[PDB]
Amino acid sequence: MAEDWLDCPALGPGWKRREVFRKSGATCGRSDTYYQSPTGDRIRSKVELTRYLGPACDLTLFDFKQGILCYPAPK
């Protein structure tokens, strides 16, 4: 009864990072990525979950597929 809800690295603990269309699929099978908050709020718009968690997390540069985000001097 689940998929691949693994510890979310980009954000950290508490956030579940599940992936889809990532395992089975051609070498270019676009894998979708959905996250589950620690309260039951599922988000899939990337920044949508960012503004949700609050100023504690961010995904503006986060890749909703690779699980990584970059920040070139956040000034």
Architecture of domain 1-75: 2-Layer Sandwich (3.30)
Q: In the numeric block, which tokens belong to residue 14?
A: 């508490």
Q: In the numeric block, which tokens belong to residue 43?
A: 């988000």
Q: How far is Cα 35 from Cα 38, in angstroms, rounded to an integer?
A: 10
Give the up-direction half-sphere exposure of residue 64: CA atoms within 13 A in the CB hemisphere.
14
Sign of CA dihedral 37, 27, 29, 66: positive
